[PDB]
Amino acid sequence: LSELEKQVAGTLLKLEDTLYISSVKEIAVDGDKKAAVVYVPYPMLQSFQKNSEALILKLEKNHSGHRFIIVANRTIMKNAYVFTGKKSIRRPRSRTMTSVYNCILDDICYPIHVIGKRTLYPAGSNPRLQVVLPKAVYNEVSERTKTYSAVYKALTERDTEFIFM
Amino acid sequence: RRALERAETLRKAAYEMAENQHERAYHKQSQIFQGRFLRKDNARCLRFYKSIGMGYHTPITAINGTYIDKKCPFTGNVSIRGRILRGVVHSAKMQRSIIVRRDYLHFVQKYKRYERRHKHVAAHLSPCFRVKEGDIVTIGECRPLSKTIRFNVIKVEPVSEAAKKRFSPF
Amino acid sequence: MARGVRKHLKRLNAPKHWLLDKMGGIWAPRPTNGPHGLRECIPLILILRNRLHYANTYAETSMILQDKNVLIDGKPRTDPTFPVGFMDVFEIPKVHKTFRVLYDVKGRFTLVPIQSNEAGFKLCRVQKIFLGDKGMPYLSTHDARTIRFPHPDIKTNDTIKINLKTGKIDEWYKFDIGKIVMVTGGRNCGRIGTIQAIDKHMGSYTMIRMKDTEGTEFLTRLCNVFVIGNDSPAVAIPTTKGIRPDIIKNRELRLRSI
Amino acid sequence: GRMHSKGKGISRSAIPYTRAPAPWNKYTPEDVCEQICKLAKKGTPPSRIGLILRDQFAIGQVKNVTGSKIVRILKAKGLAPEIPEDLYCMIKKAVAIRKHLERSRRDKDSKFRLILVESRIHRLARYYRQARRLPPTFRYKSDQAAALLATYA
Amino acid sequence: VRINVLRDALKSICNAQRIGKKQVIVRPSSKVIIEFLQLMQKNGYISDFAVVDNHRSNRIVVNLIGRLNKAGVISPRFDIPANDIEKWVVNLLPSRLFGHIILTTSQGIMDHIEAQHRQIGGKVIGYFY
RNA sequence: GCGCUGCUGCAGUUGAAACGCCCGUAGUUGGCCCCCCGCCGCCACGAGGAAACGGGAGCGCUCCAGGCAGGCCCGUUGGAC
Ligand SMILES: [Mg+2]
Ligand SMILES: [Mg+2]
Ligand SMILES: [Mg+2]
C-alpha cells in the first residue's frame, strides 16, 4: 500500500502488450539519485529473472529519479536447534545469516557474475570487503557501483567496495 | 465406555493368571482387596498406581498394564529418594534387571591431564519399559533391593542399533 | 568404636567461637542435653567465669548455681554445664542484670542488656508440625518446646512469641518476602537484613537472598534464617545494626583502640 | 595411494568457482532428469552417467543445473541401488582375486592384495552400517560373496 | 595428517620473517587464526592481511614489517586460573615488561594483561614477542 | 645436588638405545564451516562443612624461642581473616 507500487504496476501492465511483487524499499545514495529495491516473493524470483534486465531498463526509462533493483525476500532464523523439550528441531542451512547475505550479493547483480570476494583487515579502519568482477563488463556497471555498495550496506550492515579484474 | 473395556482386560487377566498353575503362589497387588473382581459393575478401581513426582510422569503402560511387581516404583511399594543419575545400558540378560555403565573424568595434577574411567551399576527394570543395549536410562535411588541393587529405572530414551560407541559422560 | 555415648570433650576439639585458650588445659566443659545442641549453644560456666568474671574457678560457679543465683527463662538452673542458646533470657536479680543472648557480627555469643517491659517473652522458631497421640496436632521449636493445639494459620518456618511465665502463643510473624531476618548459621552469623527472593530446588535445600540495610547482599540456606519482626525488630539488639565491616575498617578500629 | 600403500600423488579434479550453468545451456532440469532414468534403466553406474552427460551432452556439473546430485535424484525416483557402487566394485575385485587364486595357489602377491581389499571392504561396510544406509544384518563373507553380488545387482 | 593449522601458519610466518620477506600465504583461514592476527595487528607486529575466498578453506595473505622475534602455540590447551599467571609469564616470555600471552575465555579472545585486569582466567592459545 | 627418571624438562646415524616388513582390535588423536536453543567439560563467585599445625592483623613475656594477652577514660577491650 504505497504510491510507487501503483505506477510501477501500471508500467508492468503496459509492458506485456501475472506476476506480482511483495513490497518495495528505496534508499538514497551520496548523490540525489536513490535506488529502489523490489522484494519479490522467493518462488517467483527465477521467473522474474528470465529477462530482468529488460524489465529494469524499461522501468528506469518509464519512471526516472532512482534506480530499480529486484531481489527476493529470505528469512533468517537465529537458532541452529530448537529444544521443545520433546524433540530437537534442526534449522536448515539455507536460513543462516551467512548464506542469505551471499545470495543477496549474487542477486543484486545477477547478470554479471561475481568472480571473487576478499575481505581486508586494515590496522584500524573498520574491516571491509571488496569483490571482483570481469573486465569484459565495466562501463555497463561502473556507473552503478556506488548504488550497489549503498544497498548492500543498507540491507546488510557489512560494507563493501567494487573493483574489476 | 473406555472404563468398561479396561476392567475386562484387568478382570480377565486375574483369571488365566490363576490357571497358570506353574506359579507356586497367587501373585497379587497388596493394596487391592481381592473380591472386587466379583463386582459386575465398575464400582471400584481394579488397579493401583501412584505419582513419582520430581517432574516425572507415570507411563501409560503401568496404568493400562496387567503385571505384578512389588519393586516397581509406580505399581509397587517402593519410593524414589536421593540422587538421580543417567547412563547407558551395558547388559540386559537378567530377568527384571540390567547393568548401567557410567562415564566420568579424573584429573591428575602432576601431568595436568585427564583420564577416562567407567563404572558398572545395577538397576531394577520394571515390566513397564522396553530396553535394549546402548539406550540411555535415568535411575533413581531407593532402599536396598538386593546385594548389589539400590536403583530403579524411571525413564529411558531410545537409540539405534548402529551407532559407533562414544564416551558419553552424563 | 566406643561402646557407648561420649562424656568428655578435648579443649582442642571445642568449637572455635567459644574462645577457649589453648593452654587452659586438656579438657573443656561438656554441655548436657537440653534446650539446645552442642554446636548451637554455650555452657553457663563459660558465661559466668570467662566473661562476667563473677567466678574464678569451677567451685565458685558450683556454689553460685547451687545457691540458686541465676534464672533461665524464669526458671533457676543449678547445672554448670547447662546449655545456653539463642534468644534466651538471662536474669540475675541480686545485681538487677537482665540479658538476652544474641549473636554478634563476628559470629560469637553476646549479652544484650534489656528492660523489664520485654523480658516476659521470647521469640522462637517453628520447624516441625506433626500429629501426636490421638491425632492431636503439635509443634516444636529451636529450644526443644512442644505446644498442643496451635492455630491452623501457623505454618512451618514461622516465628512465635510466647510468655515466659506461660507457654501461650501471643503473636506469630509469618515467613514472607520483605521481612527483617537474622542469620544464625555459617559464614554470615549475626548479619541482619531483609528478604528479597526465595528459590527452591526440589528434594534439596532452599536458598534465601537478603539485602543489608546499607545495600550489601548475601545468601544462605533456609535452615538458619530467623525472623525478628515485621520490617522492624521486635526486640532490642546490640549497638551495631548487624553490619559486618571489612578487614580495613576493623584494623583501623583496632589501631584507634590501641 | 595412501591408506594401504606408500605412494602419494595428487591427481584430482578442480571444479569451477562459479555455480551457474553455461550461457549456451538449453536444457531445463527435466530433460536431464529423465535422461538419468533412461541410463539407469540400462544398468549404468552413476560415474559413467556423469561421464556420458559431460561428454555427449556437454554438461560439466549436474548440481549446477538441477540443484541436486545424481544419486539423490535416483533415490527420489526410487531407482538407487541397495549397495553403494564403490563397495560393489570392491567386492567384484575381491571375487576376481579369489577365482584367480583358486585356479593356482602358489602366488602370494595375490594373497597380499586380497588381504588389503578385504580390510578396506570391512572398514567401508562398517561405516555404511553406521549412518543406516545398510541393514545392520548386512555382513560380508568370503564364501557367499558372489551370491550377494548377483542378487543385489 | 594436518591438525594444528595455527602452528603451521606461525611457523611459516616466522620462517618468512627470518629472511626478511614482505608477504606470505597461509592455506587455513580459521577464525582463531583471524583473532590471533587481529591481536598481532593491533599490537603492531604484522600490519595488514587479507582473506581470499575459494569455497575450500580460504587462503589468507599477511604483510611483515620486522619487529616480531618469536611466536608459537601450546598444543594441549591447559586451564589457567585467574590467579595463576605469573608462573607461566616467567616461564614463557623474556621479560615482564613486554610480550603478550593469548588466552581464550568465556568473554572472548584476549591478552593476559586484560584478563589480569578482569581477574578471570581460561585456556591458553599461544604467545608472541 | 640430578635437566642421571626429564609433565614443565633427557637421549635414540657413529657413545646405551627405531621392533625385519605389512594388516589390524582395544587405546590415543582427529581438516573447515552455522552468532545466540539443551547437555559435558571449562572459568569466576557463593553456600556448607572441626580445631591444632601453616600463613597472617594487634599486643615490648627485660629481647627471643613463645603466649593470647593487657591497660585505664578500653570497638560491647581484643583474640580479625
Ligand atoms: Mg594406516
Ligand atoms: Mg597427500
Ligand atoms: Mg649405539
Side-chain angles (χ1 to χ4, degrees), chain A, chain B residues 1-8 10-170, chain C, chain D, chain E:
Chain A
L1 210 63
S2 172
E3 58 291 329
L4 315 82
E5 193 206 40
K6 307 170 193 326
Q7 320 98 336
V8 306
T11 303
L12 178 124
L13 302 123
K14 306 300 147 307
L15 324 172
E16 48 271 63
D17 208 5
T18 169
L19 265 185
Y20 205 101
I21 77 97
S22 83
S23 300
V24 158
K25 187 59 214 94
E26 265 197 71
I27 189 49
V29 197
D30 54 57
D32 262 13
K33 257 280 194 72
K34 334 170 57 182
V37 192
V38 180
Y39 302 136
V40 151
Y42 186 70
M44 299 143 170
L45 171 66
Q46 66 120 350
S47 307
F48 263 141
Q49 270 246 192
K50 46 103 156 158
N51 312 317
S52 65
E53 325 77 343
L55 194 162
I56 299 325
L57 276 188
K58 304 222 304 195
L59 219 53
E60 209 50 35
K61 78 79 208 163
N62 183 191
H63 174 70
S64 54
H66 34 251
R67 308 96 187 303
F68 285 131
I69 289 292
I70 181 188
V71 309
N73 50 349
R74 304 156 163 94
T75 167
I76 284 179
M77 307 139 94
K78 69 171 318 192
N79 263 313
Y81 284 87
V82 160
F83 194 55
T84 33
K86 282 64 57 167
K87 52 153 50 55
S88 307
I89 327 296
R90 165 162 218 68
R91 172 186 61 196
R93 271 270 199 158
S94 39
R95 308 291 201 287
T96 48
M97 181 208 247
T98 83
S99 290
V100 162
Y101 288 177
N102 304 7
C103 298
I104 288 173
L105 177 56
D106 201 356
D107 175 345
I108 285 177
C109 53
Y110 167 85
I112 63 93
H113 291 276
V114 157
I115 309 294
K117 312 190 208 175
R118 316 204 257 243
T119 156
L120 331 172
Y121 286 75
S125 156
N126 154 252
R128 65 139 192 299
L129 171 132
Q130 57 134 309
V131 316
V132 181
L133 290 186
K135 183 29 142 179
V137 321
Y138 172 80
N139 43 42
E140 291 75 11
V141 302
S142 75
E143 76 290 52
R144 45 209 285 103
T145 36
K146 271 63 55 199
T147 168
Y148 289 179
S149 300
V151 297
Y152 205 63
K153 156 63 62 45
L155 307 164
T156 78
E157 180 285 317
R158 314 229 282 244
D159 81 286
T160 181
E161 71 91 346
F162 267 76
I163 68 140
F164 290 83
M165 175 215 320
Chain B
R1 64 217 65 81
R2 63 270 164 210
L4 279 277
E5 284 122 324
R6 182 160 146 277
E8 295 334 272
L10 275 197
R11 205 193 317 289
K12 175 173 146 133
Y15 290 8
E16 53 276 353
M17 176 285 174
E19 292 73 295
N20 181 8
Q21 278 309 265
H22 277 49
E23 329 158 275
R24 289 314 218 109
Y26 190 82
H27 288 137
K28 70 158 66 178
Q29 208 166 359
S30 90
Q31 293 83 2
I32 300 317
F33 144 69
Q34 217 91 355
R36 300 175 166 193
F37 293 90
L38 310 141
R39 276 182 114 173
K40 294 176 175 171
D41 46 23
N42 221 24
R44 276 283 183 253
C45 92
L46 301 166
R47 185 139 174 116
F48 166 89
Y49 55 91
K50 65 163 80 140
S51 70
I52 295 317
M54 280 273 196
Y56 295 94
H57 292 48
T58 293
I60 311 314
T61 50
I63 312 175
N64 295 11
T66 52
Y67 64 81
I68 312 295
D69 192 15
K70 55 166 199 166
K71 298 172 187 190
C72 170
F74 312 106
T75 66
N77 42 48
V78 289
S79 58
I80 309 292
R81 58 175 171 58
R83 307 164 116 102
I84 313 276
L85 308 170
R86 216 136 47 102
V88 290
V89 190
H90 179 244
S91 152
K93 277 64 163 310
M94 270 159 150
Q95 302 212 2
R96 284 188 175 165
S97 324
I98 63 181
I99 305 281
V100 171
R101 195 182 83 256
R102 293 226 315 150
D103 309 3
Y104 54 104
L105 278 190
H106 196 235
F107 182 83
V108 190
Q109 230 294 305
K110 198 197 162 161
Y111 307 100
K112 295 135 190 59
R113 289 154 166 102
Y114 294 88
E115 337 185 20
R116 300 190 171 96
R117 293 184 164 184
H118 94 286
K119 292 238 214 208
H120 279 348
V121 173
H124 178 84
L125 174 81
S126 167
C128 58
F129 295 106
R130 178 167 236 210
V131 200
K132 49 93 175 151
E133 262 49 35
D135 293 52
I136 298 107
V137 289
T138 330
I139 56 178
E141 180 166 279
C142 52
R143 59 140 188 282
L145 306 175
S146 267
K147 187 176 180 182
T148 62
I149 293 188
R150 297 95 172 74
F151 282 91
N152 221 327
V153 175
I154 54 193
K155 209 222 299 279
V156 49
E157 277 77 355
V159 180
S160 166
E161 294 182 15
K164 28 185 178 324
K165 199 295 215 165
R166 200 172 334 282
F167 176 83
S168 85
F170 276 137
Chain C
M1 213 263 285
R3 297 175 260 158
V5 296
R6 321 261 181 179
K7 278 142 51 171
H8 293 60
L9 180 62
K10 288 290 210 341
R11 156 103 50 161
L12 285 163
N13 200 31
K16 197 35 172 49
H17 313 272
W18 291 4
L19 289 167
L20 266 83
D21 50 324
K22 186 177 101 222
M23 203 65 169
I26 288 295
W27 303 106
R30 175 72 181 239
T32 69
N33 305 11
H36 309 95
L38 210 152
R39 251 161 300 120
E40 286 230 23
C41 88
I42 184 167
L44 206 39
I45 174 148
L46 298 185
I47 301 173
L48 257 164
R49 184 185 60 174
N50 310 109
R51 209 79 41 102
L52 307 163
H53 274 310
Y54 290 117
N56 279 344
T57 43
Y58 209 97
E60 308 319 81
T61 304
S62 63
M63 320 184 85
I64 297 155
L65 291 203
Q66 82 180 214
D67 293 356
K68 317 200 137 318
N69 305 338
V70 68
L71 284 306
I72 316 290
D73 291 305
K75 288 254 269 155
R77 307 309 188 157
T78 184
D79 201 18
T81 57
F82 186 81
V84 180
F86 183 67
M87 217 92 76
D88 211 328
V89 175
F90 206 114
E91 312 184 30
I92 308 162
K94 190 168 303 305
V95 196
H96 328 315
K97 329 203 84 165
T98 318
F99 306 115
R100 190 184 290 288
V101 185
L102 280 206
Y103 267 131
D104 59 45
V105 283
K106 312 242 184 294
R108 297 107 70 156
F109 276 112
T110 51
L111 317 184
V112 175
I114 55 177
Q115 210 96 324
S116 304
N117 71 331
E118 69 104 47
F121 77 90
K122 83 189 313 200
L123 288 209
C124 295
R125 189 183 139 93
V126 17
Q127 47 218 354
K128 196 203 225 223
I129 298 279
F130 61 110
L131 298 177
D133 305 293
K134 300 155 152 51
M136 294 170 331
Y138 284 96
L139 77 83
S140 176
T141 65
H142 83 295
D143 54 9
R145 165 176 296 277
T146 61
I147 288 93
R148 191 159 132 260
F149 286 128
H151 204 300
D153 304 21
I154 306 182
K155 298 287 166 245
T156 319
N157 305 308
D158 291 7
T159 285
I160 301 293
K161 203 175 141 286
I162 60 101
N163 172 224
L164 263 193
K165 299 276 162 252
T166 91
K168 177 37 53 212
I169 295 78
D170 317 339
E171 67 173 2
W172 55 104
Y173 321 89
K174 309 255 82 204
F175 196 80
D176 210 4
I177 178 177
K179 311 271 211 122
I180 181 170
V181 290
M182 209 216 189
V183 164
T184 41
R187 264 254 287 278
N188 300 288
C189 284
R191 285 170 78 118
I192 285 96
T194 51
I195 302 182
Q196 259 87 23
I198 305 178
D199 317 287
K200 327 184 254 150
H201 305 78
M202 272 202 279
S204 191
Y205 304 103
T206 297
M207 319 288 330
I208 298 299
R209 209 166 42 80
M210 306 136 306
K211 194 143 90 78
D212 204 358
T213 193
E214 45 164 17
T216 317
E217 270 234 24
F218 45 105
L219 292 92
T220 191
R221 29 183 73 158
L222 170 67
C223 91
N224 35 26
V225 161
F226 204 124
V227 183
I228 54 176
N230 316 343
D231 309 39
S232 166
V235 302
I237 75 184
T239 38
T240 195
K241 289 89 199 59
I243 301 305
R244 180 191 304 262
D246 68 340
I247 39 158
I248 303 178
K249 275 280 303 302
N250 196 73
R251 204 210 162 214
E252 169 74 323
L253 278 274
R254 187 92 289 252
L255 289 172
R256 182 189 76 200
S257 152
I258 273 284
Chain D
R2 272 269 272 94
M3 187 161 69
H4 283 162
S5 200
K6 219 129 66 170
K8 44 203 94 197
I10 50 182
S11 284
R12 315 175 61 272
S13 304
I15 55 171
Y17 175 97
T18 326
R19 290 130 183 194
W24 37 294
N25 179 45
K26 47 182 82 83
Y27 315 66
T28 202
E30 305 326 307
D31 320 80
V32 189
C33 277
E34 39 70 21
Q35 254 291 352
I36 298 178
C37 296
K38 307 326 167 268
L39 283 72
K41 256 58 172 268
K42 293 171 67 266
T44 314
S47 324
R48 320 290 205 294
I49 285 182
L51 279 177
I52 283 157
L53 288 184
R54 169 245 266 171
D55 275 40
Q56 326 308 358
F57 286 29
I59 307 177
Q61 286 286 313
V62 155
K63 195 208 196 344
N64 286 7
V65 179
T66 74
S68 88
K69 319 225 259 160
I70 315 189
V71 176
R72 180 110 175 192
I73 294 161
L74 297 173
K75 177 135 94 84
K77 299 162 160 173
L79 204 167
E82 325 80 275
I83 300 157
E85 46 153 341
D86 35 31
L87 187 78
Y88 150 94
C89 301
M90 257 157 187
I91 296 187
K92 299 207 318 221
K93 184 152 292 268
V95 167
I97 304 276
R98 269 258 164 56
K99 186 227 266 161
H100 169 86
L101 273 179
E102 97 197 17
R103 188 153 22 183
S104 88
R105 43 175 39 50
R106 251 177 262 179
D107 196 3
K108 309 254 190 51
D109 314 300
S110 292
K111 294 167 188 127
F112 186 66
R113 302 286 155 199
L114 185 61
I115 291 168
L116 302 181
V117 179
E118 265 70 341
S119 307
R120 245 181 285 132
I121 276 156
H122 286 311
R123 290 218 242 156
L124 197 51
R126 158 183 336 135
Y127 158 78
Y128 276 134
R129 248 181 283 120
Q130 307 158 350
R132 307 80 152 289
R133 171 57 183 80
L134 279 174
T137 76
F138 179 94
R139 246 189 100 168
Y140 169 77
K141 304 274 273 148
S142 55
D143 40 291
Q144 333 84 329
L148 309 208
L149 251 214
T151 69
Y152 269 141
Chain E
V1 289
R2 181 188 279 284
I3 282 139
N4 212 320
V5 297
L6 176 63
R7 195 250 196 196
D8 302 286
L10 296 210
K11 281 284 165 134
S12 192
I13 290 297
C14 286
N15 272 273
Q17 184 95 285
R18 225 78 71 66
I19 48 179
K21 315 185 72 25
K22 305 234 150 252
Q23 282 206 321
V24 189
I25 294 180
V26 170
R27 288 201 205 86
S29 55
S30 176
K31 307 179 301 305
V32 188
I33 300 176
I34 288 181
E35 325 328 335
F36 210 89
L37 291 191
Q38 263 161 28
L39 266 79
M40 281 197 143
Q41 174 175 60
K42 175 234 70 59
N43 268 286
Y45 288 85
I46 64 104
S47 300
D48 284 294
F49 53 97
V51 185
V52 188
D53 177 334
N54 61 7
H55 307 274
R56 290 150 292 182
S57 196
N58 318 311
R59 308 169 186 258
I60 180 179
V61 181
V62 78
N63 296 323
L64 295 316
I65 64 175
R67 308 195 142 144
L68 180 55
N69 279 336
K70 191 174 192 65
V73 317
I74 303 298
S75 193
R77 270 81 163 261
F78 289 59
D79 288 322
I80 302 86
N83 66 293
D84 180 3
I85 286 169
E86 316 319 7
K87 319 174 112 78
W88 282 80
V89 152
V90 172
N91 198 284
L92 269 183
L93 301 180
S95 187
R96 299 136 36 80
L97 322 175
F98 60 108
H100 305 99
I101 305 193
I102 318 311
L103 314 164
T104 180
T105 63
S106 53
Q107 318 240 35
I109 284 268
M110 57 213 39
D111 167 19
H112 78 281
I113 297 307
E114 168 134 327
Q116 204 111 45
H117 158 252
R118 290 141 94 136
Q119 306 118 17
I120 63 140
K123 289 143 101 212
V124 61
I125 299 273
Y127 53 98
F128 53 72
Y129 60 94

